[PDB]
Amino acid sequence: GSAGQAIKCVVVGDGAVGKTCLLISYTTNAFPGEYIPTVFDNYSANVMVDGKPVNLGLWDTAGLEDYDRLRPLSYPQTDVFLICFSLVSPASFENVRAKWYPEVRHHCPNTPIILVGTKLDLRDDKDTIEKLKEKKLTPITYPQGLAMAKEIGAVKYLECSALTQRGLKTVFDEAIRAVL
Amino acid sequence: EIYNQVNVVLKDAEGILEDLQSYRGAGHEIREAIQHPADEKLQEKAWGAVVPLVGKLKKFYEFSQRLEAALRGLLGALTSHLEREQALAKQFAEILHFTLRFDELKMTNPAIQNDFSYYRRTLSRMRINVNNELANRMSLFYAEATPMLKTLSDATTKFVSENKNLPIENTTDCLSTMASVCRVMLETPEYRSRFTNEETVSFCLRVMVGVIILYDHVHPVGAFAKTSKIDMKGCIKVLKDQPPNSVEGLLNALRYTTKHLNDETTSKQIKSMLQG
Ligand SMILES: Nc1nc2c(ncn2[C@@H]2O[C@H](COP(=O)(O)OP(=O)(O)NP(=O)(O)O)[C@@H](O)[C@H]2O)c(=O)[nH]1
Ligand SMILES: [Mg+2]
């Protein structure tokens, strides 16, 4: 496992959508139940996609509203963007069209977008679905996610879970395939 | 002296690469600590393991800043006649030699960023109930695929950008001429077979003395004169670094097959070349 193509991949999204967790779950195959905010963090993994080696540089960004002036310093020379929203959080899902698409285009208008749907395992959970009922809310279904991806002009809409790792690998593989 | 400023920091370059290669990381302790958050005994083993690694990462980063500062200090002296410009080219080749290895080892080692990210992720956690400003710069350093090349390129472009009066060629000429002479040494023509590692190094010594003697004959002032481009004093020192049996043919050649060696103008220190 020697050197490969350096592909930069910045992950953006609100707090508690699951940006940090799906990066730690992908690289380390571990899931932290503990929630700690990250202003900015970075990971990497030497992987093989379509018979070509890739040194996938991963740039984890802050989701809070207080890091708007500090977040865009990690944007330059980006090869792909992962706009991450939780499927169990409509607010986050609208913040995609409301903020992220404007923001990532504003700094990097020509760099691809991969619209990722986080916490896929919670969409079909009585506990989690009763609380949405409780707060008068219906989980963001696949058609909505795809329709949103088509609007912002994202090359692929993927949905995955950092805990179960259902379709976690496909997100990064498609993230790399967009820059080959 | 700011001319051996880059050489002073490169003293510890071997130790930096040796520590960087041996950097196995602490991915196993970090992972099991995350798998079982509540186990305080396992959180100590993970945190205790991280301290050693971060200290080395700080040691590596601080090295890049010293090497950066030394390179800009070297380029700074460029500004201020009889310009020893080999220092620029000599130390460029020396730091780039080191830079390619540093980047190569870091490139293929995701444990570095893994450890670091955990470290600052568990600082926040500990915020609930190294220098913070430094850690942020370190995070951005290891985020890059080639930290040292990024640091060098940024440092050199920072110099030329705040010295606009000097054209880009002045500093980038040495970099382009070095690549052509190397090609001359390494490239093997069609007429002869490829040289061995011993022959290419031998060849390199012969051409060096060869072009100096041919330059001495064709150029008016010669190679020995005080106001020359040759800087022979240095070229002879390189020959006397080599074994006495090796290079005797080249060493002699300068003694009697030159033009401006014995003339009055030549320095008597340069004449110091005897044999028995
Ligand atoms: N059930 C479930 N929980 C998840 C999933 N992904 C993340 N979480 C939970 O989300 C919380 C932390 O999310 P995290 O990845 O840190 O969010 P972030 O995108 O980093 N937010 P921030 O910008 O503040 O750093 C934790 O409670 C973690 O267990 C998932 O797929 N399923
Ligand atoms: Mg985060």
Numbering used by the authors:
A (entry chain BBB): -2 to 177
B (entry chain CCC): 9 to 88, 96 to 144, 154 to 300
What does the paper say about this structure?
Rac1 is a major regulator of actin dynamics, with GTP-bound Rac1 promoting actin assembly via the Scar/WAVE complex. CYRI competes with Scar/WAVE for interaction with Rac1 in a feedback loop regulating actin dynamics. Recently, a novel effector of Rac1, Fam49B also known as CYRI-B (CYFIP-related Rac interactor), has been reported to bind to active Rac1 and oppose the activation of the Scar/WAVE complex (Fort et al., 2018). CYRI-B, its isoform CYRI-A and the Scar/WAVE complex all possess an evolutionarily conserved Rac1 binding domain (RBD) termed the DUF1394 domain.
To understand how Rac1 interacts with DUF1394 domains in general and CYRI-B specifically, we determined the structure of the complex between CYRI-BΔN and Rac1Q61L. Attempts to co-crystallize CYRI-BΔN and Rac1Q61L.GppNHp were not successful, most likely due to the low binding affinity (measured dissociation constant (Kd) of 25μM – Figures S3C and S3D). To overcome this challenge, a 10-residue linker (GSAGSAGSAG) at CYRI-BΔN's C-terminus was identified that successfully produced crystals of the complex that diffracted to 3.1Å resolution. The crystal structure contains one copy of the CYRI-BΔN in complex with one Rac1Q61L molecule in the asymmetric unit where Rac1Q61L binds in trans with CYRI-BΔN from a symmetry mate. CYRI-B binds Rac1 through a unique binding interface using extensive contacts with the switch-I loop and is distinct from other Rac1 effector complexes. While the interface between CYRI-B and Rac1 is unique, its contact with the switch-I loop of Rac1 explains the specificity for active GTP-bound Rac1. The R160 residue of CYRI-B forms a salt bridge with the side chain of Rac1 D38 and an additional hydrogen bond with the main-chain carbonyl group of Rac1 F37. Q153 and R64 of CYRI-B form a hydrogen bond with S41 and N26 of Rac1, respectively. The main-chain carbonyl of M147 forms a hydrogen bond with N52 of Rac1 and S157 of CYRI-B peptide carbonyl forms a hydrogen bond with the side chain of N39 of Rac1. Interestingly, following the overlay of the CYRI-BΔN structure with that of the CYRI-BΔN:Rac1Q61L complex, we can see that the C-terminus of CYRI-BΔN undergoes a conformational change such that it undergoes a domain swap with a symmetry mate. The conformational change is induced through a steric clash between residue Q2 of Rac1 and Y305 of CYRI-B.
